[PDB]
């Protein structure tokens, strides 16, 4: 009964993961889209403080490299809201 | 809200806490001849509370002693079992945690330094010898303790006890592993110093209580069984799997209360029913007689999945 | 902390119960045996930790060399009992 | 007869299902009628917070294909 | 710089629906529309810049809601009920709904025609075509 | 054998302790399912399946996953 229990879970294991599977490309398109904006959200702000600092471009990759980089957590909301940040940095770990 | 649902899931269980001794009182008795205590209440059921302010009012004698160890021990014993039912999944558990069994495992293992420090802090060299006894059983028997759980998971798939109430949605994880429940059993037998493996409190004065009267002696005294009830509840989740219907979800924890109860019953029955076993015949059963049984079928445990094509589904 | 809310109030309780039942109320014990299971424990102890992730390893991919190593992992302990039983260990 | 221990019983026995119907219906209530959902897993916690920044602040009120 | 794209350039409608929604309907999104939605993905894998195929992604959310406008159309009641059963499970489990599924697919297999992918046939990995010239010198390696 | 016996009767957990030992040796050994753990696991999809550009050289790769080419869980199916 184990046996057959376990291998009709499995393909319930299969059935969902596949689902996903397929909602992951419109999460991808969602996740990237709302990225760059808290990116870009914080070049707005950035430049708006930075603008009075002497001789300091708004913003620069300290890494020379023109490849895309993911931002850390960190940079994302660190000039956000403190509870967001906090949401993002042990949010998943206290669940709900 | 959440407060009040921890009111519920510790008053509940303290109240039931102080039944069990009740219950322990009358059922020994009638088996034993006799009525038990009927007289104070109607049938008994002030007597549990009776006791507590008798032990509480007395004198700590604090007995000399080192003092923090007289005062934190007791709070360990009672704060890890009353803390092991956060996490336990009656219908659904309060603090699901991915790592549900490990915490319990976790938490119990702590519980043997209580026996420790309480041993080390009375100032009697007889107590140091008796906190010894309860120690070194207690981290021998977690280790069958562990391993049989080991095998219970490789046919889960998880640590998190929420999933063996989808695992046991067809049949009891008795029916297969019954070898081990057994094994499980007289572990839990043994983790709550009940009869059979009592050696604790034994011929010592019939070890860790030697020195603790009136409220530490009360702490411990809740701990145990508390975690009596606990262990029992686990047997009544991990093996025999209460039925489990969406739709009504109290229909398993009644159910879970039917098991447990039963189980409860079995270790009060076990203890009128059994001498005490011997300091070195309860180490020869668990490391001869168990552990080579509980290794080998922790590697059929292993090997059923597998060449069964059985692998359970992570998650 | 939705589990540090359960646990300080679990030692809240506790705390309260001793603080009052406290206030309310107003050398060379040594056996190398118990040396020797001490060490023995954790031997199985750090045992149980290299088997305990055997429910991921489980859903390993190789599945051969899961087993093949679990196999040798729990065989050979348990030859190291054996050997604790041949000689005078466990034998109290 | 042994049917006095029976009290005693059922004073544990009610003790003890309280708490798996409390826990039961204290998640029943707080989150909209809908069990709590189990992240156990980040996607699932993504896919929790996903549902927060759809509606109001809370993941439990869900908006449908009439939207 | 950082040339982050500005947000007029990323402001495009999305599905929006809760979670349980988009599960109820996966299978069969996964469906009508992996065409484009590989296409967005084989953008994004191999031109590791998300910004670089920021359009694709338009394009994802844009397929995906005429899925559901075209749902919303037909058999629409049966996916109703279908989500509102699999939404109150706690890891919305598909196995406590299979009653309410059949309706909806069955429904969709004589209205909109669409069909639920057997066991599979999604993981499998597919091979679309797109113009965007593989990326070269992805890394920009030096 | 003979000794065999008085251990199946004096010290009779050893001897299914071993018992078991050898037959969880065995069993994965020689079974008509052994192989499926490998493949039932291995087929369990956890990371998305990234999709190869079409150079059109390609006719074993199902163009869309629905299509009659590629892999198949059938034997997962009717196990
Ligand atoms: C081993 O043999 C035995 C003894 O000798 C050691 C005993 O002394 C005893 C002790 C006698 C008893 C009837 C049990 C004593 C039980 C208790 C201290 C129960 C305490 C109960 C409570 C604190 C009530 C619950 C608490 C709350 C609701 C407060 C919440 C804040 C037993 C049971 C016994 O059988
Ligand atoms: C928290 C930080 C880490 C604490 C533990 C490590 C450091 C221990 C330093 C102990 C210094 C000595 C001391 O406290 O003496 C009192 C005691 C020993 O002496 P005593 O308090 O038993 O002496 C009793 C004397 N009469 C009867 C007159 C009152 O220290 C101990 O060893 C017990 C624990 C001390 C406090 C530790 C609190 C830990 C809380 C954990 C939760
Ligand atoms: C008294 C001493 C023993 C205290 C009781 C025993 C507590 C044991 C805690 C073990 C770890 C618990 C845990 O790991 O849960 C983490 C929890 C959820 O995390 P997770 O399971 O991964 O789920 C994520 C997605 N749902 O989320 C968390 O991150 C919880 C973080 C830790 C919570 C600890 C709660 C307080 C316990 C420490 C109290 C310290 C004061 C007493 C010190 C005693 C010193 C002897
Ligand atoms: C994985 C874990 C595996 C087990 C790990 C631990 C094994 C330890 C074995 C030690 C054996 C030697 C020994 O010391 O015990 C002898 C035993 C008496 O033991 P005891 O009185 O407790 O005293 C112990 C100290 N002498 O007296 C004995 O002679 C016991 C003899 C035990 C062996 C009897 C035969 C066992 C094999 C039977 C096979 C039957 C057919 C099996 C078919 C399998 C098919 C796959």
Redesign the pocket.
Known sequence: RMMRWNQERRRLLIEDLEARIALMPLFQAEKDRRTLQILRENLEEEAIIMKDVPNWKVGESVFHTTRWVPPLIGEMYGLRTKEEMSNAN?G????? | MFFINILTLLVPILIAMAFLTLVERKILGYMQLRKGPNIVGPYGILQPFADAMKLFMKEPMRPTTSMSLFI?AP??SL??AL?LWVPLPMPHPL??????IL?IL??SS?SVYSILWSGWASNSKYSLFGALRAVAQTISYEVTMAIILLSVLLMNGSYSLQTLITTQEHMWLLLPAWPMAMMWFISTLAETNRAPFDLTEGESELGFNVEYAAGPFALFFMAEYTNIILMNALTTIIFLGPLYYINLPELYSTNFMMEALLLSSTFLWIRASYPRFRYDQLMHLLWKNFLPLTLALCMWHISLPIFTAGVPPYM | ????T???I??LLSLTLILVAFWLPQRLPFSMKFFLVAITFLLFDLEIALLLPLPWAIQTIKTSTMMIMAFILVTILSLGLAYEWTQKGLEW | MWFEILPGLAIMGVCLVIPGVSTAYIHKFTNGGKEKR????QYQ?YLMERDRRISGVNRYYVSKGLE | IVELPTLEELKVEEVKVSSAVLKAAAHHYGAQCDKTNKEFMLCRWEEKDPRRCLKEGKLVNGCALNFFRQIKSHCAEPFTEYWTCLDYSNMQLFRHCRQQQAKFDQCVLDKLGWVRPDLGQLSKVTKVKTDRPLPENPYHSR | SAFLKNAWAKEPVLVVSFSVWGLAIIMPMISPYTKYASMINKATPYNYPVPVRDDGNMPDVPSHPQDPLGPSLDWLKNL
């Open positions: 042990f998943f770990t206290w669940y709900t | 934190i709070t360990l704060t890890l803390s603090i699901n945690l991915n790592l549900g915490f976790a938490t702590l | 902390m939705n589990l540090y359960v646990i300080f679990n030692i | 189990v992240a156990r897993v916690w």
